[PDB]
Amino acid sequence: XHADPICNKPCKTHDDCSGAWFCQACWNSARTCGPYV
Amino acid sequence: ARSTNTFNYATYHTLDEIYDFMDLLVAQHPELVSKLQIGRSYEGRPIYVLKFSTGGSNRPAIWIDLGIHSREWITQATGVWFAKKFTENYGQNPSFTAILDSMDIFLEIVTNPNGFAFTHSENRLWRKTRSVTSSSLCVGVDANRNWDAGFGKAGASSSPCSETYHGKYANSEVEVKSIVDFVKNHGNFKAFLSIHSYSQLLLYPYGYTTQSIPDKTELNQVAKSAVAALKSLYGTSYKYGSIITTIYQASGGSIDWSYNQGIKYSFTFELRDTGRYGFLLPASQIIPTAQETWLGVLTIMEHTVNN
Ligand SMILES: [Zn+2]
């Protein structure tokens, strides 16, 4: 509801990032959904 | 405003305020700077490259790009500070003057002009260009997924509504073709740096593959060195390594391509934040970011002249 629930979710694939509109990349160094920079 | 001494470097400006500063700078230093139009955007805006030279042949140039991604505002704004700073350090700083006395620098502040103005009047979080065409209803290409480096392989999305959408073919994007043709004509690029936002990382090839660059060693250490130096001013701590290794597999990225072209010192910088602020880095954070991030580009250059 307030932006990106998925952001900062523990990731392992880009896929394990259900679908945040924002945070949809896995960062292979803080294995957390973040957005593409 | 009417002078580069009076243009406010610690504010976020607009396209028009920046195409304009570029005009003040040259008029102020026509003997050091030139403004080059290497192309016209998607939606017709001129793409400008600023060349910094003390003369000579087809001297080996350094390429630095900013804003391939419009939302990433601190890069355009770091971009403006570098132009200002080239012009002042020349003949001041022996280091910096040594380098302009041997190499030309090519500065491109708004690589994606279309997308940047888009972030101003419409959506602040736009990352792609504003190309229409496609079985689309869906506009724009991730221009850092369009270069001919493992193009269209994993790390780039095939659907057009995608954030990481790669375009229908490599260089399809004119913002992306300009640079390429340009880089490719000159043929004396011994460096290529691409500035991005945010996260405090200094990245080298590759993005679309696991195989490791031959010059892996060299780049690691310069990377090592260059992250060291940025940290000297405010203590900002970065991480460095290949892209595939430290953020994410990304086929078709800018560095990938330049690297395979033979542009050995090809690095991608991810500037500040780490995420509190991310794409909306407050304005009070520009001079700082620019000053540190210059200590780091500076390192890569001494290195570039040294070898
Ligand atoms: Zn980016």
Asked whether the beta carbons of residue A24 and residue B163 sit closer than 8 angstroms, the reply is yes
Q: Which chain A residues are within 8 Å of B239, Cβ to Cβ?
A: 29
Which of B179, B155, B180, B175 lies closest to B166 in space, CA to CA?
B155
Domain ranges for chain B: 1-307
* B18 vs B45: CA distance, rounded Å: 13
E strand or H helix at B108 = strand B104-108
Phi/psi of residue B157, nearest 5 degrees: -80, 140
Which of B10, B127, B129, B122 lies closest to B74 in space, CA to CA?
B10
Select the residue from A14, A24, A36 to test the B interface by mutation, using most B Cβ atoms within 10 A: A36
Asked whether the beta carbons of residue B247 and residue A35 sit closer than 8 angstroms, the reply is no
**B2 CA: distance to closest CA in chain A (Å):** 34
Record the tokens describing residue B191, joined without a space.
Answer: 């460096």
B251 residue type, one letter: S
B267 residue type, one letter: F
What letters, b where the CB count within 10 A reaches 16 and e where it falls short, cover B12-50?
bbebeebbebbebbbeebeebbebeebbebbeebebbbb
Distances, alpha carbon B214 to alpha carbons B152, B218, B222, in Å: 23, 9, 14
| Cβ pair B229, B295 in contact under 8 A | yes
End-to-end CA distance of chain B: 40
Phi/psi of residue A35, nearest 5 degrees: -90, 170
Directed axis angle between helix B216-230 and helix B286-306, to 10°? 140
Would strands B61-65 and B189-197 be described as parallel, antiparallel, or unpaired?
parallel
* B22 vs B14: CA distance, rounded Å: 12
* Domain that includes residue A30, residue range: 1-37
| Cβ pair B132, B79 in contact under 8 A | no
* B100 vs B96: CA distance, rounded Å: 7
- Residue B19: which residues within 8 A CB-CB, separation 6 or more? B46, B48, B110
Considering B108, B173, B175, B270, which one is annotated as catalytic?
B270
B270 is catalytic: yes
| Number of inter-chain CB pairs under 8 A, A vs B | 33
Q: Which CATH superfamily is domain B1-307 in?
A: Zn peptidases (3.40.630.10)
Nominal resolution (angstroms): 2.5
Is B240 known as a binding-site position? no
Task: Please count the structural domains in chain A.
Answer: 1
- B190 in helix, strand or coil? strand
Asked whether the beta carbons of residue B199 and residue A35 sit closer than 8 angstroms, the reply is no
Q: Which chain A residues are within 8 Å of B245, Cβ to Cβ?
A: 28-29
